[PDB]
């Protein structure tokens, strides 16, 4: 089994937990929690979010 990584934060995503978004251009995004994903959806900038 394969630990993936949050496309926003950089947190380790174990099996199960988190969501997987597939953008219309087919680029894949993985989020470890509804927080990260929301930030992404808010169009926030992971370079400016301190805990990322």
């Amino acid at each position: 089994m394969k630990v993936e990584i949050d496309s926003f934060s950089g947190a380790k995503i174990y099996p199960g937990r988190g969501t997987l978004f597939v953008r219309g251009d087919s680029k894949i995004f993985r989020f470890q929690n509804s927080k990260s994903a929301s930030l992404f959806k808010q169009r926030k900038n992971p370079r400016r979010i301190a805990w990322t």
Binding site: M1, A11, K12, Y14, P15, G16, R17, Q32, N33
Partner: protein, 386 residues
């Protein structure tokens, strides 16, 4: 006048009446069919629901899309320290039913059991079994006579056993006492196995093994008094309706002139007893072992207990049954694992599982880490721990 359109009714009339159970330990109303050609063992066991975690394993289901592929699965862990045998009960068949002939108790009873016989223990003088223990002190006889009285007569034999709840994280000091049927051979060998195990202790591994199908007997979590909508699953009424929409519109036809046993009504929901069957053992946990949450594939040394412990429970310091899926009743509740009533081949039933990985991350919120070790790696070093 013949309802406009048909739909099946709401709720299963076989689970009536829906009331609060007559006790928090749910009853084992059936035991596996005895095959007396085998060694004498217990047909069930006592434990406490700790909580749940997840699991990753490869599926053996040839012909399925996911055959030879990795799946995740929910699992409940049952905290199941061993049990100690305090007694034996003979049961005799009668034209009016099964009847209890005698009961014989071990000479010394753990204070956890004695606690169960008392409503107010602290101020009681704890007269316990005190006069009953004289039956041993007299060399023999009165215990032996009844012990043989069981052999001479009883068709069924059961051991009274009780949980060691001090080993268990709960605050409750009152242990749980239960009858378990003895499914090995030969009522004599049964009662012999019984008294040889007086004051002795029996462990989960003696009863269940990996991949075994088992049934869970538990009192479902109580919700109290409930409206018809969520108790019976009725459709909600429209918004426009006077005097509330969470009701049932027509509770009865004009005739019969009584509202009927079969109609949905508000009242108690949950705290019902449930016998839930066909749950596969994904793990027989090992009390002393520190690999409790480990795997051949994932070799990191860790226990089954997550980070921050099992929420609202504690840590698993004893042997644990980790069974697939979910189980009736809630965390901390005494539960009864009972081995299956019927021989089930299925396919799903006979598959052997071996886990690749067990989730130890915290259930107190969304955990990013498995061991506190793994955390220090990712996190680095904080202002704390200077």
């Amino acid at each position: 006048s013949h309802r406009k359109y048909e739909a099946p009714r709401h709720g299963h009339l076989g689970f009536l009446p829906r009331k609060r159970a007559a006790s928090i330990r749910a009853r084992v109303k059936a035991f596996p069919k005895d095959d007396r050609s085998k060694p004498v063992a217990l047909t069930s066991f006592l434990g406490y629901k700790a909580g749940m975690t997840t699991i990753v394993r490869d599926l053996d289901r040839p012909g399925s899309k996911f055959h030879k592929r990795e799946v995740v699965e929910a699992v409940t862990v049952v905290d199941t320290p061993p049990v100690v045998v305090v007694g034996v009960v003979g049961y005799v068949e009668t034209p009016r039913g099964l009847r209890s002939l005698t009961t014989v108790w071990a000479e010394h009873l753990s204070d956890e059991v004695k606690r169960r016989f008392y409503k107010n223990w602290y101020k009681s003088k704890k007269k316990a079994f005190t006069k009953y223990s004289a039956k041993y002190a007299q060399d023999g006889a009165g215990i032996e006579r009844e012990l043989a009285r069981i052999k001479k007569y009883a068709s069924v034999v059961r051991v009274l056993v009780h949980t060691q709840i001090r080993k268990t994280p709960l605050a409750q000091k009152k242990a749980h006492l239960a009858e378990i049927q003895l499914n090995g051979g030969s009522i004599s060998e049964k009662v012999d196995w019984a008294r040889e195990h007086f004051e002795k202790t029996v462990a989960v591994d003696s009863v269940f093994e990996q991949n075994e199908m088992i049934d869970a007997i538990a009192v479902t979590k109580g919700h109290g008094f409930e409206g018809v909508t969520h108790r019976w699953g009725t459709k909600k009424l429209p918004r426009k309706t006077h005097r509330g929409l969470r009701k049932v519109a027509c509770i009865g036809a004009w005739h019969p002139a009584h509202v009927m046993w079969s109609v949905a009504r508000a009242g108690q929901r949950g705290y019902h007893s449930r016998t839930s069957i066909n749950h596969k053992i994904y793990r027989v946990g090992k009390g002393d072992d520190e690999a409790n949450g480990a795997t051949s594939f994932d070799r990191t040394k860790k226990t089954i207990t997550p980070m921050g412990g099992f929420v609202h429970y504690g840590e698993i310091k004893n042997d644990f049954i980790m069974v697939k899926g979910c189980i009736p009743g809630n965390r901390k509740r005494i539960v009864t694992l009972r081995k299956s009533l019927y021989t089930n081949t299925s396919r799903k039933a006979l598959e052997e599982v071996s886990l690749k990985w067990i989730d130890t991350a915290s259930k107190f919120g969304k955990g990013r880490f498995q061991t506190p070790a793994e955390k220090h790696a990712f996190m680095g070093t904080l202002k704390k721990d200077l």
